[PDB]
Amino acid sequence: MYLRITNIVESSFFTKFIIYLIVLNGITMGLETSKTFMQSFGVYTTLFKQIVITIFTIEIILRIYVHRISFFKDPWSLFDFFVVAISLVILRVLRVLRLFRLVTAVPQMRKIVSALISVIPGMLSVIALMTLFFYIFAIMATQLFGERFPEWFGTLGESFYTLFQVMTLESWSMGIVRPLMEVYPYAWVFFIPFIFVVTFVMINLVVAIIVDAMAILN
Amino acid sequence: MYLRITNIVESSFFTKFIIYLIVLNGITMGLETSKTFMQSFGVYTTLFKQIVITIFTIEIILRIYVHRISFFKDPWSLFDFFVVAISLVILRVLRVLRLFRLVTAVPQMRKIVSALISVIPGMLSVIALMTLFFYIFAIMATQLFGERFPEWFGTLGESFYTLFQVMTLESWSMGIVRPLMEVYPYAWVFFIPFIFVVTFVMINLVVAIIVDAMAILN
Amino acid sequence: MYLRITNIVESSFFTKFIIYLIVLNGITMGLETSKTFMQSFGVYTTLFKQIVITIFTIEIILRIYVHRISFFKDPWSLFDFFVVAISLVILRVLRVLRLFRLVTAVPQMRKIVSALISVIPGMLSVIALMTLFFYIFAIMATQLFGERFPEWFGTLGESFYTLFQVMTLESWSMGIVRPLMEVYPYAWVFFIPFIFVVTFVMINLVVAIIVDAMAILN
Amino acid sequence: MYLRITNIVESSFFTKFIIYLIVLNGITMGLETSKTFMQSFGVYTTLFKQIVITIFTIEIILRIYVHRISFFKDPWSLFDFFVVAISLVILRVLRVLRLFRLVTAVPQMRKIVSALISVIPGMLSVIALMTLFFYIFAIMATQLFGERFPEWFGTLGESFYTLFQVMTLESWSMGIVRPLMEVYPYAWVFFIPFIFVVTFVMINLVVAIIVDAMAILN
Ligand SMILES: CCCCCCCCCCCCCC(=O)OC[C@H](COP(=O)(O)OCC[N+](C)(C)C)OC(=O)CCCCCCCCCCCCC
Numbered sequence: 031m032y033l034r035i036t037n038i039v040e041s042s043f044f045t046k047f048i049i050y051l052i053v054l055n056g057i058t059m060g061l062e063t064s065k066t067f068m069q070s071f072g073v074y075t076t077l078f079k080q081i082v083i084t085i086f087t088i089e090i091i092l093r094i095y096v097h098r099i100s101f102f103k104d105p106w107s108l109f110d111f112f113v114v115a116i117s118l119v120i121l122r123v124l125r126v127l128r129l130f131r132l133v134t135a136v137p138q139m140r141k142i143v144s145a146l147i148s149v150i151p152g153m154l155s156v157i158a159l160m161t162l163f164f165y166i167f168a169i170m171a172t173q174l175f176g177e178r179f180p181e182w183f184g185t186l187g188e189s190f191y192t193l194f195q196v197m198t199l200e201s202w203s204m205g206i207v208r209p210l211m212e213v214y215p216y217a218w219v220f221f222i223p224f225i226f227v228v229t230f231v232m233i234n235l236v237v238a239i240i241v242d243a244m245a246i247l248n
Numbered sequence: 249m250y251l252r253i254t255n256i257v258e259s260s261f262f263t264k265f266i267i268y269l270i271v272l273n274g275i276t277m278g279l280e281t282s283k284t285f286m287q288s289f290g291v292y293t294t295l296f297k298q299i300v301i302t303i304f305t306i307e308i309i310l311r312i313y314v315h316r317i318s319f320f321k322d323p324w325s326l327f328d329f330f331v332v333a334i335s336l337v338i339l340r341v342l343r344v345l346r347l348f349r350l351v352t353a354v355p356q357m358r359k360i361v362s363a364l365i366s367v368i369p370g371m372l373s374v375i376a377l378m379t380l381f382f383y384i385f386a387i388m389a390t391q392l393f394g395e396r397f398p399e400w401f402g403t404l405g406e407s408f409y410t411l412f413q414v415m416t417l418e419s420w421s422m423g424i425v426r427p428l429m430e431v432y433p434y435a436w437v438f439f440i441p442f443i444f445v446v447t448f449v450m451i452n453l454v455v456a457i458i459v460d461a462m463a464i465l466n
Numbered sequence: 467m468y469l470r471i472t473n474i475v476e477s478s479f480f481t482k483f484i485i486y487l488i489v490l491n492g493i494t495m496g497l498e499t500s501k502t503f504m505q506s507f508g509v510y511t512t513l514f515k516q517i518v519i520t521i522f523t524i525e526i527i528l529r530i531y532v533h534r535i536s537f538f539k540d541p542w543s544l545f546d547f548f549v550v551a552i553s554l555v556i557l558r559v560l561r562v563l564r565l566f567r568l569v570t571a572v573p574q575m576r577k578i579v580s581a582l583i584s585v586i587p588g589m590l591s592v593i594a595l596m597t598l599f600f601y602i603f604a605i606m607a608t609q610l611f612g613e614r615f616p617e618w619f620g621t622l623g624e625s626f627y628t629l630f631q632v633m634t635l636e637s638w639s640m641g642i643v644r645p646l647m648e649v650y651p652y653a654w655v656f657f658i659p660f661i662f663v664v665t666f667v668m669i670n671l672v673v674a675i676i677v678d679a680m681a682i683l684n
Numbered sequence: 685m686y687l688r689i690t691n692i693v694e695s696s697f698f699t700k701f702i703i704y705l706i707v708l709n710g711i712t713m714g715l716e717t718s719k720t721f722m723q724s725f726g727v728y729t730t731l732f733k734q735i736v737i738t739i740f741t742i743e744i745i746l747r748i749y750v751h752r753i754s755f756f757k758d759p760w761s762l763f764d765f766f767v768v769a770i771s772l773v774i775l776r777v778l779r780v781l782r783l784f785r786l787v788t789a790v791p792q793m794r795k796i797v798s799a800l801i802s803v804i805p806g807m808l809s810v811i812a813l814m815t816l817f818f819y820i821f822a823i824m825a826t827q828l829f830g831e832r833f834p835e836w837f838g839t840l841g842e843s844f845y846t847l848f849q850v851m852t853l854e855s856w857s858m859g860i861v862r863p864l865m866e867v868y869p870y871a872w873v874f875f876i877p878f879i880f881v882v883t884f885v886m887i888n889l890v891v892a893i894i895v896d897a898m899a900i901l902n
Pocket residue numbers: 150157160161164181185186187188190191192194235429430433434436440
């Protein structure tokens with residue numbers, strides 16, 4: 031019977047049925063953002079969501095019965111477990127994460143996702159350096175401009191936020207630095223080098239990725 | 249006579265004449281955006297456009313007489329057919345699409361266009377993942393901020409639009425997220441990871457393209 | 467004497483002296499943007515500029531005496547000729563172009579400039595396609611939104627300008643498309659595909675450059 | 685004893701202790717940006733910072749005793765020396781730079797930092813050209829628009845700042861060039877080519893980096 035349960039679990043139709051259920055329920059959560067739709071079919075849609083979640087729970091149970099410890103050493107299975115647990119109870123909205131199951135159920139999506147994920151270890155150094163950079167400048171900015179510009183630099187977290195904004199170049203001058211220089215005429219001395227460093231590091235992060243990809247092909 | 253009609257259709261001067269006609273008519277549609285020009289020569293320009301379209305129709309007819317089914321299995325010919333059909337009747341403006349005939353008539357333009365087009369199949373996976381990502385976050389954003397920010401997140405389509413805007417980094421913070429945090433102090437928890445994921449995926453989309461190009465050269 | 471004049475013209479000290487003169491005169495044009503500096507030394511600076519230009523003219527004359535037709539088949543010499551001619555008379559400001567002589571006089575600068583220039587022929591196709599794209603969309607935009615939005619789409623040139631702005635993503639939505647959709651609710655149908663095409667083409671332009679560079683190295 | 689002092693200085697535990705001290709003191713400078721934290725523990729935190737700096741001084745002294753001239757021919761040691769000297773006395777805030785010691789103390793951080801630094805010599809040409817470009821256009825912009833737009837082009841430094849802003853595409857049109865064209869209708873003639881050149885040069889700077897990286901791998 032154990033072998034029968036695993037033959038049922040590992041069959042192409044079992045997973046195809048899962049995928050079809052995921053697609054239907056994604057359509058449902060789309061329709062659910064509509065207020066008038068919920069006035070007509072809110073009952074039936076809530077019902078459909080309840081039955082979908084119980085199905086996914088019973089199926090996770092069966093998949094655990096098939097692989098005892100293998101389930102919890104598997105990043106994809108750990109992900110499916112954790113999203114269905116989240117949904118089993120901000121949390122109301124967080125239920126929508128169960129749609130990322132399409133990634134773990136469809137092999138094409140797994141292929142591309144783990145490709146992306148495997149790019150990450152090679153960036154671990156340049157991230158740390160940039161974090162340190164951000165951290166240091168955040169401190170400086172909070173001390174240089176927090177008292178007079180409390181909403182952008184008044185705390186370390188505000189300074190982090192604004193520095194991130196400056197790095198994306200989003201209104202860095204007309205919205206942050208020119209207003210500063212009305213009070214601190216030499217604030218560009220802080221922000222131009224920052225932008226320079228931040229851009230140069232970003233560029234190298236990208237070039238590194240490219241070369242590492244080439245290295246695994248050649 | 250069939251062979252005579254195909255010798256006429258496939259000649260360098262037939263296509264050169266088509267190209268010259270396309271260029272003249274593009275000049276005409278440029279001049280047509282001018283109101284005072286239309287006050288002096290509007291009649292003659294409308295006349296010229298009418299005769300151009302009948303010529304392109306008669307020539308599509310001849311090209312069909314030359315290739316029976318080959319015409320409709322050919323992406324370039326399918327394109328020429330569909331644009332001249334559009335123009336044969338928002339539709340008034342859509343007539344201007346007939347200028348993309350310069351691409352299908354000039355071989356250099358075909359070369360570069362199909363180069364671009366052939367880059368696309370290799371991106372098909374990363375597009376799907378990003379779409380799913382957008383779709384999920386659109387739902388969440390609509391539930392988190394639709395009621396209080398109806399013009400940016402009130403519907404799924406509005407949320408898609410604003411999320412796309414955030415991905416291009418166009419006023420993401422001074423125009424969207426800081427206004428949000430005046431009400432939802434922790435909205436950055438939603439948008440920073442979003443930007444992070446969206447940027448990282450874009451970068452990999454680009455690096456993939458680069459390596460695939462290298463793979464077809466080496 | 468001809469050989470003596472060419473030995474004088476082609477000597478390392480002749481060009482070193484030119485380079486030193488260029489640097490001094492660039493310093494001068496920097497100091498000249500200052501109004502109070504011009505109140506104290508405006509006379510001497512104008513004098514210095516006059517003598518610099520006569521020197522460059524006499525030296526172009528000598529260089530012509532050395533190479534009769536070679537001078538006018540040489541892109542660098544053609545450039546030096548044309549800038550000194552511009553300065554020999556908006557034109558007041560255009561005199562400042564003579565500082566690009568540092569590029570033609572210093573070999574390192576020539577190396578890098580012609581590297582950049584030689585990247586250009588390989589882009590000639592993708593530029594033409596994008597131009598055609600811009601031209602077509604400019605026409606459409608002028609017809610779709612010129613009457614109601616005269617300052618951004620009222621003419622073909624205005625539409626070109628605004629489309630270029632949208633391509634750089636500079637306020638594309640908060641400043642152009644959301645204001646449009648207050649009147650034309652479906653204007654995103656025009657602008658999102660535009661951005662998509664424009665970005666994709668830009669990306670391929672860049673990837674092409676990269677691969678072409680690799681092709682000349684391998 | 686000299687050999688004993690160098691055995692103490694070069695030991696893994698000496699550097700591990702330095703690294704732990706750096707991390708603790710970074711935590712401290714983070715906590716120090718908080719005003720209420722300083723009301724409760726400001727005394728103890730200032731005390732901790734004092735003892736940290738004396739420790740780093742005594743340790744730099746020992747490291748000098750170990751390597752006489754080697755210390756001052758070493759870029760990392762020169763950096764540690766210069767930051768601790770800065771902190772030994774705007775300067776109040778500049779003390780925070782001592783956190784970049786984590787880079788010089790951790791080998792992973794040294795690896796990635798010198799990787800970045802070694803990318804730089806290959807860019808030295810394209811930087812100079814771009815600087816010259818900026819300098820020339822700064823002069824022109826100051827003469828074309830300084831009198832009427834004193835806050836953006838009134839001086840050479842203001843023009844540099846605004847040109848840099850335009851290069852990052854940060855409000856280049858809605859904030860700079862459209863306001864200009866209300867007065868100088870043809871100002872786009874200046875700024876579009878500028879953007880074009882500036883973008884093209886940036887792209888080549890990046891492509892160069894990529895190919896140079898490939899050249900050192902193949
Ligand atoms: C895939 C491999 C790993 C990739 C992971 C990337 C790691 C990112 C590092 C983030 C480090 C955490 C920074 C941090 O402590 O943030 C704290 C702040 C606190 O927010 P808060 O003070 O509440 O915000 C102000 C809100 N307001 C106006 C309503 C008062 O919250 C914020 O302000 C958010 C700040 C975002 C800054 C992001 C820093 C990025 C550093 C470089 C990232 C990598 C670049 C390649």
